[PDB]
């Protein structure tokens, strides 16, 4: 079971046209055509502190996973597919929108995401995943 | 005509009295005495990338201008008109909401936006404008 | 009175349990357990400009104070009550939402924000307080 205690991190990707043009705070990018299994969207940091015997976790929005995917929306609700996986190659699980460590206590480092099987076909604009910190018990 | 095609950004003013406090992180304010034509209000990034053959662009919101004139809003529908123009001397041309480049081609810089027209008679607020980044295609 | 002229600061607290985890941007996070009087939150920068002859002020949200407190509120409107004080020892003065400089002209510093009163029972979750630039009439 997860338990919120911490702080929300937003990621950002824009689906665009192969030509496209960046206005103002410099966020990622990656054409239509670009959408395949495996490719890298961004990193998000994760301090996990004061969880001595406790397992550090994460909760995605309701509006960014279902019982099977979880995924980025756009203002739309369209639905762009990913996958998280911590930098260091320590182990962690995924399922029902919480990502969350194997080994407890305290961890510092970074989660990639990226794109979760072939999606070419997902329509252009900007999509969101907002993830918050807490920690598992079981 | 307009084709989206990368990010978007805001740009802000807050139009104040002549006693103003900035309170936060540093932002443009303009008393209203001072909202004068060609007054400088801000400057905005803008990279166009993978347009070879393409004129890049920029569009504004719906609820940023009209037949005439583009234009920052308060949140009262208050309309500060203003004007584009490339830092670099780059040749754009503006009509009915779309900033487009004359040349087609990658390029990057920042556009400068400024009062068009002498405006002392606007309220004081927070006024905003959104571009969204696309190409042009005749 | 507070005549509104100038922008408006945002700070955010996230009261939590003792393990936590903060997640994409670094923001303020305390435990419930270190919600004791005086301790630090936060600092907001204020520069007042073309104040000549007029007193630097700040107001809080409808939302962050009555008659007795000023706080910072939380989505569900719990309240975790603050007091301001500027970093270089200048005299202001707090009353009703308004944080007003004694002395005229204009100035430019920091205000600290801290916990007023030990509050160790407030619940966790996100909470805001919003101040916007003016002057003291």
Redesign the interface.
């Known amino acids: 079971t997860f ?9 950002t990707l ?1 689906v ?12 990622a ?1 990656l ?1 239509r055509s670009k959408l395949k299994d495996d490719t890298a969207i961004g990193v ?9 015997g ?1 397992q ?3 909760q995605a929005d309701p509006d960014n996973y279902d019982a099977t995917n979880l995924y980025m929306t756009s203002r739309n609700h369209d639905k762009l597919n990913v996958k998280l996986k911590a930098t260091d190659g320590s182990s962690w699980t995924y399922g029902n929108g919480v990502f969350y460590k194997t080994e407890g206590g305290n961890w510092g480092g970074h989660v990639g995401i990226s794109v979760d099987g072939n999606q070419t076909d997902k329509p ?3 999509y969101t995943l907002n ?5 598992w018990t079981n």
Chains 1, 2 share one sequence.
Do not use: F, K
């Open positions: 338990q919120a205690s911490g702080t929300t991190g937003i990621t824009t665009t046209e192969e030509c496209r043009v960046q206005v103002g705070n410099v966020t990018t054409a998000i940091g994760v301090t996990a502190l004061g969880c001595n406790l550090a976790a994460l252009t604009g900007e993830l918050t910190g807490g920690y």
